[PDB]
Design an enzyme around this catalytic site. Structure first.
Site, PDB file in Angstrom:
ATOM      1  N   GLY A   1       8.614  -0.969  -0.856  1.00 28.10           N
ATOM      2  CA  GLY A   1       7.213  -0.798  -0.548  1.00 28.10           C
ATOM      3  C   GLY A   1       6.309  -1.067  -1.744  1.00 28.10           C
ATOM      4  O   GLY A   1       6.742  -1.452  -2.827  1.00 28.10           O
ATOM      5  N   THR A   2       5.015  -0.852  -1.517  1.00 30.90           N
ATOM      6  CA  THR A   2       4.026  -1.056  -2.566  1.00 30.90           C
ATOM      7  C   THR A   2       4.168   0.007  -3.648  1.00 30.90           C
ATOM      8  O   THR A   2       4.459   1.172  -3.364  1.00 30.90           O
ATOM      9  CB  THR A   2       2.614  -1.023  -1.982  1.00 30.90           C
ATOM     10  OG1 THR A   2       2.389   0.239  -1.342  1.00 30.90           O
ATOM     11  CG2 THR A   2       2.434  -2.142  -0.964  1.00 30.90           C
ATOM     12  N   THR A   3       3.956  -0.400  -4.896  1.00 27.74           N
ATOM     13  CA  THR A   3       4.137   0.499  -6.025  1.00 27.74           C
ATOM     14  C   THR A   3       2.943   1.434  -6.185  1.00 27.74           C
ATOM     15  O   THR A   3       1.808   1.101  -5.827  1.00 27.74           O
ATOM     16  CB  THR A   3       4.356  -0.297  -7.316  1.00 27.74           C
ATOM     17  OG1 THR A   3       4.683   0.601  -8.384  1.00 27.74           O
ATOM     18  CG2 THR A   3       3.109  -1.089  -7.683  1.00 27.74           C
TER      19      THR A   3
ATOM     20  N   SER B   1       4.947   5.865  -1.485  1.00 30.93           N
ATOM     21  CA  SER B   1       5.438   4.490  -1.527  1.00 30.93           C
ATOM     22  C   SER B   1       6.675   4.407  -0.645  1.00 30.93           C
ATOM     23  O   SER B   1       7.702   5.021  -0.951  1.00 30.93           O
ATOM     24  CB  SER B   1       5.756   4.058  -2.957  1.00 30.93           C
ATOM     25  OG  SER B   1       6.270   2.738  -2.988  1.00 30.93           O
TER      26      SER B   1
END
Lengths: 139, 243, 262, 85, 85, 243, 326, 250, 41
Positions: B30-32, B75
């Site tokens: 996922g996005t950090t 996240s």
């Protein structure tokens, strides 16, 4: 280093009775143990521990010195081989004293458990300790 | 026999859990998002990867606020991250009913710690494959916690998760050694955007959007809000200047 | 000479285990005759991989200087007709010629196990291979100057009969070093590495979890490539912790053996 | 020098050392003496202690050959070395 | 085995070994739980190796107790189990 | 058929695989902890291991306080520990409300053992991967230590131990009780039993601990508290000076 | 003080200072004093935990009745203590009953006083359902009839134990029955029943675990039965393995038991006409140590009599040592 | 959530038996070896305390619990499965009798309730059968002394004397010739000691052996006097010093 | 096989006494040895 000041450690302890010989020399005991322990064969100076023999000899009975040899045998003594050198120091003043201390010399041999307990035989001198007891029984 | 990884409650012969380990792998897809702890509060930061130009700017809220002073950022999977915040909101609301004054940060971690662990005990439900980073200003000092898929958590002076978790956490150790005595809340805002750009080397193939929300007693005085106005653009030019 | 007693540091607690079964009987064999105990022949080395169990073989060859023979598990498995059983008798044939000889064994996962005969697609060559290793240390042939150093990744893959006394007398375990033993390892690999004058390795001590002596070397190797991109000859101490954190994510597989390991 | 095996030592000496000395005792009692003696139990402990004591006590011809020693690199040499023992 | 079979082993091996009068072999016999003959041989050898590290000669009572728990369990923990009660 | 190793049922060998696999999950953290019973009290010492600098040592604790008269020490994963910690506090406070007074140490280890068996006998839930060790001083038996287990069998010990080196710790501490023929330490002061357990812990583990490398719990009569980093460091200095 | 340790240590000193008879009245003062838990004993005071110290007080004085001449008075002292133990718990009943008999039979005493006490102790088991207690005393009672040299009372108890121990209980105690039965027919010059009872004793020896004293007595009496057919080479192995059993007991058994074993080992070697093997045992210090007498040195002249082949030297020490060797 | 397993974990094998119970008897035959014997003056039960650790405290462990003051129990199986079963056994004893009939249930009526809990676990889903075997022995005012053997299958059988454990094969055979029609309370204790001593591979003392006997009603152990109806409980457990008294009596 | 074992062991005890006959002494020792093998394991 720290071994250069060993002569200046105790000024008064030579003249007086020096009841602090156990406590004052302890500051020079536990410090030099951490730098050697059982690792190095010869590291610390073995003459520093032998100073206790030169502290109280003629001016004090031999029973108080034998009690200190028991604690040094159980503890490290700044070196694992420090006991090897202390045996020759105990036998040095016995032949140089004599006088009325010959009667107390019999009890010193039976009190010390170093010569009684078997070891890897680092010195021949401790084997002759029981030999001197045989000559006493002959007389 | 095979099947140690079929169910949840089944323990592996090595002493691990496959459903827990596979949930951690979904965290790095996922996005950090990162975070910075200060003396008077904590600072949250998240990097949302923009898919196409069809995304309307600043209409997607990555950092969801529980009660007032308690911020939350996650996240991982979207529904698993929003379910913990929606569950944590009911825990903070039910607490203030009986217990009056709001729940502190270290006490709120026990609500999610037992809730996520309850999913790993039964095969009827699944654990959360999302890593939730929550914190804020409590009654005494401040605290920051990162909820792992296994339910394990501790106090974090800094937090890093996501695809850039490797390069982002390495920069958090430099910030601690830079200011070992203490770090102001205003300086950490610009330092939070700088670490994101340093961790953008892995995500550089797509478009990024900066979203930062901080809480402390110095300015907001116990209020967790986002960054709007010239304060957000000031942290962008300061962080991109070193690049 | 490459690896010495200084590079194997951190194992000092386990280093004296080999000195008693190797250096002690060879230097003064009469000590065992005074007490009456028999000199130990075989010595078992087991534990997690990467702890330096192989380095114990190279450290003795560069110090004692006696003639040694490296015997890998897969080097004697050549088979024509009863070949593996003959090759074993060839290695022990040099024991009676040269007295100061110590034969090693390198990571035996195969011919050290029990594995009795049911089916197994004609294993008689490996089955008789086990019988030869249990022969020279058993039968009436007396040597006493030959030591058997056997290394393995786990005792459970070894024949319980081989684990019985009379063949391997002392089992020297090489577990993962403690927190005080790891710090000495960082200074060994970084001794020849150029870096800044100000260095602190106590940071990587807490960062190390379940690591071995080998994985610490990988931390210094990976840290060297971090300064190449920035064109730096000296490695930044902050980059040292970046590699340690990187190695922590490299394993992901097991890393813990406890209950079934002696 | 080896104790505790006197239970199994008496059975071996009667089936090994006894028939080699007096072979007429079995003919009188009408019992066929076994042509040999096997050994069982957990490996790596015994079976070398009692055999070594018999070789020293008997002081006669003794042949010690490993089980896998009969295997030779040549085909026909294997069976020829078995009959030669 | 039991204490009756092992008592003829410890006393037999200790004949050539150098022990101390204060040490008692019957103290360990009670502590021995179902052991074999080979494991006993490793106990007498390990007790002599510990005397070298402690700079001793004869085998004391402490050398037998410290070398006991090390060589008594040859597999994992206790008889490759943990506890059943 | 091959599901005998998945859910808890009678095995063809007469054992339980999931119960045996639960002991391998207690050492995941690899933390050695020992506790000795003083004359008037009982002291416990556990290793404090902080892997990362981002973790706050004050927030990280493996020792939980159930009540003022009852301490608890857990060796294993923290998520299964905090799940059993919040549950043990609910059953301990229920005794004071329902039965009117404070629960002793043997009963709390008995109720949690029967509760841990519910995690076992029931096939739709899994046993806890932690071992609850309760340290408390009762009004009748005085100092006592009871150690639980995922199988649900509680038993009292003189000096308890845990970790992978437990075999080395138990053997080293066994020689003290068998030689002195005493069931408890004769030291009256609670400060002497702290330094006594550290000496045997260093020699057995072969490691010199620091101020942040240990967490020492102290359970006195009708009082329980955990020593901070300053109190633990003060005890370590006095040991090196005296011994 | 009222502590039990002060009462025992003060009474032990009075024995060496003046006499044990003055300290005997001190133990009699412990019957109406020194209260304890549970119930009472003789009705004057409550004695339960303090009975063990009162039992030891009798054990210390039990060996001292030889000088006073109270052996005849000891006949009624033991059975009266059984009735005193019926008031409180019976857990201490077997202690005082069994321990005194072991000490009462250890000191030299007339055979009439030993039998009559064991007969009264069985009477307590006759009124009750006691089984193992009655059977344990029957073995010790039949042993006393053996020293009486009367086969009527000895075989009467043995025949009753065979129909019981075989079909009911006491597997290890059955070995002592066959051992005692083999001794009875040994004095009757009957080799058929003596060798048959010894074979049955050796059958249950390996089947049921036996202590050191039981196994030592089996091989000791075994080699005696091997003296009729001679073949002293195999018979010497019985006394050789027996001496190692009695020597390891040291103070746990009587010194007269191990001293007699040396007499049979030396006699077995003289029958084999081996001079050197006899001198090797006498010259060895570990084979003698604290065991020496005139009967031991009497066989030394016998070995020298056959070595020099002189009858006059044998007849000279024959009548002089007749009070010992013969 | 809740529980999604409603199916019975115990299924009928094609050979005509149950796989869970067939393997339940294996766990009983391997473990602590207990025993029991019934006499005319009382019932004598005994068991051995195994030592998992040398620092373990034997006083904190009760191998013989108390169901009713007149009835004891002993188990050769696993510890946890015994405690939950007995904790549920005292509840059904007080609810169905003390709260209804007012007195304690006898030995015959109590074993039916204790076995009722185990037989339900062998069928109802979500649970597994108990791998323990309990020996229920007690005394009443009519039927007298009786000893029942509760098997993990849920069926109970009366026995004069029985032994269950690792030595259950050898000990049960020995008790056939060691039992007769006339025995006392103290006479059956020596029988239990001779049988258990052969099964002890560890230290032999009173701390490692739990010996409980059912004698006459004791007014001292009751705690109150003045009521002729209740003379005190018949169940009594010998302490460490009291067990060592009869060990040397053999 | 147990009956043949008693017959086989009947001559084993006769070899210890070095006699050419088997009396009741050997049968009593032979049965006790065979009965212990069946009760063992």
């Amino acid at each position: 280093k720290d071994y250069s000041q060993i002569l200046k450690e105790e000024f008064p302890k030579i003249d007086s009775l020096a009841q602090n010989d156990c406590n004052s020399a302890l500051d020079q005991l536990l410090v030099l143990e951490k730098k050697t322990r059982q690792a190095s064969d010869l590291a610390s100076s073995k003459e520093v521990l032998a100073k206790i023999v030169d502290l109280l000899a003629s001016r004090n009975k031999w029973d108080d010195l034998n009690e200190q040899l028991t604690l040094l045998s159980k503890k490290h003594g700044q070196l694992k081989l420090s006991i090897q050198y202390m045996i020759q120091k105990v036998m040095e003043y016995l032949k140089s004293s004599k006088s009325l201390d010959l009667n107390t010399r019999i009890s010193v041999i039976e009190t010390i458990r170093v010569v009684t307990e078997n070891k890897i035989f680092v010195e021949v001198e401790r084997a002759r300790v029981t030999k001197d007891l045989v000559e006493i029984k002959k007389e | 026999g095979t099947g140690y990884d079929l169910s949840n409650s089944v323990f592996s012969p090595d002493g691990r859990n496959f459903q827990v380990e596979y949930a951690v792998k979904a965290v790095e897809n996922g996005t950090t998002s990162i975070g910075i702890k200060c003396n008077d509060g904590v600072v949250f930061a998240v990097e949302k990867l923009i898919t196409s130009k069809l995304l309307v700017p600043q209409k997607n809220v990555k950092i969801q606020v529980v009660d007032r002073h308690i911020g939350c950022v996650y996240s991982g999977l979207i529904p698993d991250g929003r379910h913990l915040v929606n569950r944590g909101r009911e825990e903070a609301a039910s607490f203030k009913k009986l217990y009056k004054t709001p729940i502190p940060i270290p006490a709120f971690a026990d609500r999610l710690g037992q809730y996520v662990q309850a999913h790993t005990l039964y095969n009827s439900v699944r654990p959360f494959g999302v890593s939730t980073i929550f914190g804020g200003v409590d009654k005494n000092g401040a605290h920051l916690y990162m909820l792992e898929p296994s339910g394990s958590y501790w106090g974090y002076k800094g937090a890093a998760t996501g695809k850039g978790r490797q390069s982002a956490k390495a920069e958090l150790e430099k910030l601690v050694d830079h200011h070992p005595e203490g770090l102001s809340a205003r300086e950490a805002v610009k330092q939070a955007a700088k670490i994101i750009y340093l961790a953008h080397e892995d995500n550089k193939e797509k478009d990024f959007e900066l979203e930062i929300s901080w809480c402390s007693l110095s300015e907001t005085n116990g209020l967790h809000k986002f960054v709007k106005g010239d304060l957000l653009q000031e942290a962008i030019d300061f962080a991109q200047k070193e690049i | 000479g490459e690896i010495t007693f200084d590079g194997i540091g951190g194992l000092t607690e386990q280093i004296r285990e080999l000195r008693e079964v190797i250096e002690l009987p060879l230097k003064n064999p009469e000590i065992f005759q005074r007490v009456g105990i028999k000199p130990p022949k075989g010595v078992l080395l087991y534990g997690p991989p990467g702890t330096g169990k192989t380095l114990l073989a190279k450290a003795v060859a560069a110090t004692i200087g006696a003639n040694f023979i490296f015997s890998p598990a897969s080097g004697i498995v050549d088979k024509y007709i009863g070949e593996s059983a003959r090759i074993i008798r060839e290695m022990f044939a040099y024991a009676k010629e040269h007295e100061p000889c110590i034969i090693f064994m390198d990571e035996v996962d195969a011919i050290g196990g029990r594995r009795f005969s049911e089916g197994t697609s004609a294993d008689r060559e490996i089955q008789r291979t086990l019988m030869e290793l249990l022969t020279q240390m058993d039968g009436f042939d007396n040597l006493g100057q030959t030591k058997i150093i056997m290394a393995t990744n786990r005792p459970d893959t070894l024949d319980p009969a081989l684990l019985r006394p009379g063949r391997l007398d002392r089992k020297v375990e090489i577990p993962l070093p403690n927190e005080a033993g790891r710090l000495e390892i960082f200074k060994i690999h970084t001794a020849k590495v150029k870096k800044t004058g100000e260095f602190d390795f106590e940071a990587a001590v807490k960062m190390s979890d379940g690591f071995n002596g080998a994985d610490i070397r990988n931390c210094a190797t990976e840290a060297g490539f971090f300064a190449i991109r920035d064109d730096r000859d000296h490695i930044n101490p902050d980059d040292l912790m970046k590699a340690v954190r990187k190695v922590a994510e490299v394993k992901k597989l097991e890393g813990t053996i406890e209950y079934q390991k002696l | 020098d080896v104790g505790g095996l006197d239970m199994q030592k008496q059975e071996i000496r009667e089936a090994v050392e006894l028939p080699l000395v007096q072979a007429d005792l079995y003919e009188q009692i009408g019992i066929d003496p076994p042509r040999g003696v096997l050994l069982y139990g957990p490996p790596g402990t015994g079976k070398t202690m009692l055999v070594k004591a018999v070789a020293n006590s008997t002081k006669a011809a003794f042949i010690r050959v490993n089980g896998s020693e009969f295997v030779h690199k040549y085909l026909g040499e294997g069976p020829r070395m078995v009959r030669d023992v | 085995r039991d204490r009756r079979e092992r008592r003829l082993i410890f006393g037999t091996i200790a004949s050539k070994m150098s022990l101390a009068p204060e040490a008692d072999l019957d103290s360990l016999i009670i502590r021995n739980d179902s052991l074999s003959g080979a494991v006993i041989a490793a106990i007498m050898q390990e007790a002599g190796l510990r005397a070298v590290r402690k700079n001793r000669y004869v085998i004391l009572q402490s050398d037998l107790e410290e070398a006991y728990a090390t060589q008594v369990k040859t597999d994992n923990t206790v008889d490759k189990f943990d506890f059943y009660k | 058929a091959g599901y005998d190793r998945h859910i808890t049922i009678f095995s063809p060998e007469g054992r339980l695989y999931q119960v045996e696999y639960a002991f391998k999950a207690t050492n995941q953290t690899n933390i050695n902890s020992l506790a000795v019973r003083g004359k008037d009290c009982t002291v416990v010492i556990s290793q404090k291991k902080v892997p990362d600098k981002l973790l706050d040592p004050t927030t990280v604790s493996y020792i939980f306080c159930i009540s003022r008269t009852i301490g608890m020490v857990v060796n294993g994963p923290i998520p299964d520990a905090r799940n059993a910690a919040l549950r043990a506090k609910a059953e301990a406070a229920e005794f004071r409300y329902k039965y009117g007074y404070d629960m002793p140490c043997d009963v709390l280890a008995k109720r949690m053992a029967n509760l841990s068996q519910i995690y076992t006998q029931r096939a739709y839930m899994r046993p806890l991967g932690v071992i609850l060790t309760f340290v408390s001083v009762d009004e009748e038996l005085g100092p006592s230590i009871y150690k639980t287990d995922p199988a649900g069998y509680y038993v009292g010990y003189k000096a308890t131990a845990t970790g992978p080196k437990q075999q080395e710790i138990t053997t080293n501490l066994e020689n003290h009780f068998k030689k002195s023929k005493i069931d408890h330490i004769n030291e009256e002061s609670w400060e002497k039993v702290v330094e006594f357990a550290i000496t045997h812990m260093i020699d057995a583990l072969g490691t010199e601990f620091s101020k942040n490398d240990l967490e020492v719990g102290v359970a006195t009569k009708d009082k329980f508290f955990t020593l901070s980093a300053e109190n633990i460091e003060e005890r370590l200095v006095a040991i090196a000076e005296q011994d | 003080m009222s502590l039990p340790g002060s009462k025992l240590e003060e009474a032990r000193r009075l024995v060496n200072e003046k006499q044990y008879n003055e300290a005997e009245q001190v133990y009699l003062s412990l019957l109406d004093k020194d209260s304890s838990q549970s119930s009472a004993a003789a009705g004057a005071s409550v004695d339960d935990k303090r009975r063990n110290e009162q039992e030891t007080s009798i054990l210390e004085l039990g060996q001292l009745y030889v000088t006073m001449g109270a052996k005849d008075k000891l006949r009624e002292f033991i059975p009266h203590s059984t009735e005193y133990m019926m008031q409180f718990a019976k857990s201490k009943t077997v202690k005082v009953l069994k321990t005194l008999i072991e000490k009462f039979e250890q000191v030299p005493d007339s055979l009439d006083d030993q039998i009559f006490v064991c007969e009264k102790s069985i009477e307590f088991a006759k009124r009750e359902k006691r089984v193992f207690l009655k059977h344990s005393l029957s073995i010790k009672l039949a042993t006393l009839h053996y020293q009486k040299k009367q086969y009527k009372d000895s075989l009467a108890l043995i025949n009753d134990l065979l129909r019981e121990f075989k079909k009911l209980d006491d597997k290890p105690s059955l070995v002592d029955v066959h051992l005692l039965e083999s001794k009875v027919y040994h004095k009757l010059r009957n080799l058929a029943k003596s060798k048959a009872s010894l074979t049955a004793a050796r059958t249950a020896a390996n089947s049921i675990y036996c202590p050191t004293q039981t196994v030592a007595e089996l091989d000791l009496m075994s080699g005696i039965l091997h003296c009729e057919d001679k073949d002293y080479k195999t018979a010497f192995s019985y006394f050789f393995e027996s001496f190692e059993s009695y020597h390891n007991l040291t103070t746990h058994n009587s010194y007269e038991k191990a001293c007699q074993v040396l007499k049979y080992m030396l006699l077995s070697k003289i029958m084999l006409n081996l001079i050197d093997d006899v001198k090797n045992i006498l010259n060895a210090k570990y084979t003698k140590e604290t065991y020496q007498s005139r009967g031991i040195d009497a066989m030394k002249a016998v070995a020298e009599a056959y070595n020099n082949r002189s009858l006059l030297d044998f007849n000279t020490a024959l009548k002089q040592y007749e009070k010992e060797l013969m | 959530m809740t529980d999604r397993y409603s199916f019975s974990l115990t299924t009928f094998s094609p050979s005509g038996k149950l796989g869970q119970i067939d393997y339940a008897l294996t766990a009983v035959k391997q473990g602590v070896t207990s025993l029991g014997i019934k006499a005319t003056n009382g019932v004598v039960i005994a068991t051995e305390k195994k030592s998992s650790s040398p620092l373990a405290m034997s006083e904190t462990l009760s191998k013989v619990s108390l169901l009713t003051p007149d009835i004891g129990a002993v188990y050769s199986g696993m510890g946890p499965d015994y405690r939950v079963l007995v904790d549920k056994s005292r509840k059904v004893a007080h609810t169905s009798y003390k709260r209804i009939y007012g007195e304690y249930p006898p030995t015959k009526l109590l074993v039916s309730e204790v076995a009722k809990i185990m037989q339900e676990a062998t069928q109802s889903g979500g649970v597994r059968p108990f791998g323990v075997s309990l020996l229920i022995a007690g005394h009443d005012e009519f039927n007298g002394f009786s000893l029942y053997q509760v098997d993990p299958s849920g069926s109970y059988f009366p026995w004069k004397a029985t032994a269950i454990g690792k030595g259950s094969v050898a000990a049960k055979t020995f008790l056939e010739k060691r039992w007769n029609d006339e025995l006392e309370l103290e006479d059956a204790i020596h029988i239990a000691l001779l049988t258990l001593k052969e099964s002890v591979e560890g230290e032999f003392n009173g701390d490692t052996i739990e010996l409980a006997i059912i004698g006459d009603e004791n007014p001292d152990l009751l705690g109150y006097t003045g009521i002729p109806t209740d003379k005190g409980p018949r169940f009594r457990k010998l302490t460490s010093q009291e067990i060592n008294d009869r060990l040397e009596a053999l | 096989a147990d009956v043949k074992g008693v017959c086989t062991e009947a001559g084993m005890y006769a070899l210890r006494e070095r006699r050419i006959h088997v009396t009741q002494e050997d049968f009593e020792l032979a049965v006790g040895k065979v009965m212990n093998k069946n009760q063992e394991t």
